Amino acid sequence: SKEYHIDEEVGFALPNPQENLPDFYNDWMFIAKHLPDLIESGQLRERVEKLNMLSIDHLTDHKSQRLARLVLGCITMAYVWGKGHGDVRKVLPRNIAVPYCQLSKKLELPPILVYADCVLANWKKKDPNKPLTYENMDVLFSFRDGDCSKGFFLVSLLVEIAAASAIKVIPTVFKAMQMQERDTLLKALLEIASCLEKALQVFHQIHDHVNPKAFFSVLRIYLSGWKGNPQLSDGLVYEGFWEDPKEFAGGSAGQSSVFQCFDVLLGIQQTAGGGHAAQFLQDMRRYMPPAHRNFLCSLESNPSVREFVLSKGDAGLREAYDACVKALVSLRSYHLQIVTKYILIPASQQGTDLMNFLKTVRSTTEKSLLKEG
Amino acid sequence: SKEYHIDEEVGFALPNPQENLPDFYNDWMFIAKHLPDLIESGQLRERVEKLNMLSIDHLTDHKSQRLARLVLGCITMAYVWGKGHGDVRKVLPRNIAVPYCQLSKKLELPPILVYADCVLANWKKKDPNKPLTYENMDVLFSFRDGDCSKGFFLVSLLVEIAAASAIKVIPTVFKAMQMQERDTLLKALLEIASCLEKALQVFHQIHDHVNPKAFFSVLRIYLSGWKGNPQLSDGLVYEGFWEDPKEFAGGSAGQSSVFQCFDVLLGIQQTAGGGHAAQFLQDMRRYMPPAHRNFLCSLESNPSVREFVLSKGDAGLREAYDACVKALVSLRSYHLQIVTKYILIPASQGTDLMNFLKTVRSTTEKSLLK
Ligand code: HEM
Ligand code: HEM
Ligand SMILES: Nc1ccc(Br)cc1-c1nnc[nH]1
Ligand SMILES: Nc1ccc(Br)cc1-c1nnc[nH]1
Ligand SMILES: Nc1ccc(Br)cc1-c1nnc[nH]1
Ligand SMILES: Nc1ccc(Br)cc1-c1nnc[nH]1
């Protein structure tokens, strides 16, 4: 494919992301690398206010400024949300908010933590020679001890990598339709569903690394944004960069392109319409790296594969297409099981629009099947 | 630019749009050509209700499926707004509701009259071998007598054709960036800024052929949509297509590709920053013909012209890039002077509106280099 920066083996996730910033930023990196201890002792908001306003101009390449965008993004959630039970600050200091919005504007991303930061750029191979397994991988930053941020971010990364192996098949699919090669288009679709089926099995690992109350009561808070949230009703002022407070949404997996790019490929129109589900997933495209949100829109530029499969009265071709589609339903169905475990049940041991959103994304996917009515 | 359906002479507008449908669709074109008298006669809404459910199967080519969408688009606005004084139908008759909505589904458009309908496809040459200027041109459809829809639809279209002259230069700009031909890139930038300066001058003709009396009270009413509008709080029931009422946004020039396409070429990211202006302009892209939101998406897929000019420290390149940005700034600021004459003082005889345009104009200003 063209340079949408889709690595061959890890896909959309940043390949071998950078761990250490230049020594010029050693005072950023200390607060980020010690987020749990600084928060629970009560010194974080202090220690960020005692920083100097460092300059982006020492952030050379892409990998360095993503890492800096991750460091600054995690520090921001640490500042805004505090210890995570209510004492909130709605003003981000200038020494932190200026370099953030400058770096973020250079990367065409909003100034808030996003899936591309805490997942796609927040990982590390422990042994550079063993494969991308959970036990060979680690996270770069956490918010609190026992927040399961290692499990949550790494499992998502492993799921994204699993679905990424289907991305290299997409070029075959489009050429097979163009040159009208039915047998290759069949197995091409068959293998895309194969990778999406492998993605579902890696997703099962989340039970082994994420605890329901930790996620709910801890990790959920530090991933919250300030769009539509009462606690910051008008958003967050970025002192020294913007005059009025701005409103940006929290990090979500709807910000990932692989999870969006298969509805687009299979003609499943999650973004079509004016409904809340459609507009939300359209909104989250703006929280993706620019190269990624361009990859989605250039898939929409191609001819519909859903129609090509409809147009041909081919049973083996419609079942192959349906295999892709079902895999998405199976992923989204098992996913509802998991938001029930990790959000719904803990929410009652101390809401519905969340469910209806997911069941609508799910419904749209099931309705896209051609067979099994 | 292979088949984003850009015309060499006309640009994103439909080149020489078709005037008459098949005679199978004479029942449609009758209401469409006779909207002014049928609306004032109060007989419009019935003649829509007492028409058969025609099939879209006999609209063969793009040019026929377009003006069919133009015909059904105007009939729908008239049926929903009526005489234009507040009394609103909230249900679309199913014998018009679904020929419209499957023709819209075929062209990937939303079922409502939009900029590509009433401007890009709604024109004609008076004398075929005379130039594309206002006197030699006319619009194919109007709403009410004296609504100045001819002026408002033509001066917009003529502005769109002036900017089309710069579309020819876009491949030269990117080919220059890759081959690294800094001399050819500069004149390419200057030729672009040149046409955006002739687009502002063509825009001056607006004060001639449209009238603040008629635009605010008549034309703006018939071009209004049912999205975030209290008159159709929940939208329009497209009877026989969706049980629920769907809500679509009205017509806007933000639905035009040329004016979004220069922002993206120059790295002016209106659509970025999470602002209200960012989302309106992006949501307007789904009200565009599919090749035009395709062409726009693939411009963003190229390396930004803005950063190449910043890399070089080339005062000449920097001045050329500014020349286009300033052409955009003055287009938007002179455009702010027109909403003042045509929307605000008329409404004095609303302000979230100009907040959008000033934010949009200021981000155009903040993009200047020195
Ligand atoms: C504790 C585990 C999880 C919980 C509680 C959870 C919860 C949620 C919630 C609340 C939403 C609604 C969208 C939003 O609020 O932004 C959502 C959607 C979504 N989730 Fe998760 N999630 C979890 C794990 C995962 C993982 C590991 C993935 C990796 C693929 C994932 C993929 C998605 C996607 C793609 C969406 C967007 C809707 C769609 O495209 O189907 N989720 N989830
Ligand atoms: C009486 C004349 C006009 C009035 C009152 C008017 C009004 C407006 C309004 C209210 C908006 C805000 C967006 C919206 O509410 O839809 C807007 C934006 C816009 N106008 Fe017009 N307009 C006029 C003529 C024109 C013409 C002839 C053009 C030529 C194409 C044009 C180009 C644009 C564009 C492209 C936008 C989108 C915002 C931008 O990109 O700058 N306007 N105008
Ligand atoms: N899997 C994830 C990884 C990182 C971030 Br931020 C959010 C999610 C998510 N999962 N469901 C909804 N969002
Ligand atoms: N909800 C989704 C939508 C598209 C894709 Br691809 C994956 C998921 C998913 N959810 N949990 C794990 N994976
Ligand atoms: N110039 C236009 C022509 C047709 C339609 Br519909 C809308 C406009 C417009 N201008 N400013 C905002 N919208
Ligand atoms: N508002 C605009 C935005 C972009 C471009 Br290009 C032209 C205009 C304009 N149209 N009439 C007056 N100005």
UniProtKB/Swiss-Prot annotation, chain A:
Molecular functions per Gene Ontology: electron transfer activity; heme binding; indoleamine 2,3-dioxygenase activity; metal ion binding; tryptophan 2,3-dioxygenase activity
Cofactor note (record): Binds 1 heme group per subunit. In the active form, the heme iron is in its ferrous state Fe(+2). The catalytic cycle does not alter the oxidation state of the heme, but IDO1 is prone to autoxidation.
Chief location of this protein within or outside the cell: cytoplasm
UniProt note on regulation of activity: Activity is inhibited by and MTH-trp (methylthiohydantoin-DL-tryptophan), modestly inhibited by L-1MT (1-methyl-L-tryptophan) but not D-1MT (1-methyl-D-tryptophan).
EC id: 1.13.11.52
Keywords: Cytoplasm, Dioxygenase, Heme, Immunity, Iron, Metal-binding, Oxidoreductase, Tryptophan catabolism
GO CC aspect terms: cytoplasm; cytosol; smooth muscle contractile fiber; stereocilium bundle
GO biological process, one term: positive regulation of interleukin-12 production
Cited PROSITE patterns: IDO_1, IDO_2
Keyword Disulfide bond: no
Binding locations of heme b: H335
Locations listed in the record: Cytoplasm, Cytosol
Swiss-Prot/TrEMBL catalytic activity: D-tryptophan + O2 = N-formyl-D-kynurenine; L-tryptophan + O2 = N-formyl-L-kynurenine
Subunit structure: Monomer.
Family, similarity comment: Belongs to the indoleamine 2,3-dioxygenase family.
Name used for this protein in its record: Indoleamine 2,3-dioxygenase 1
UniProt source species: Homo sapiens (Human)
Gene: IDO1
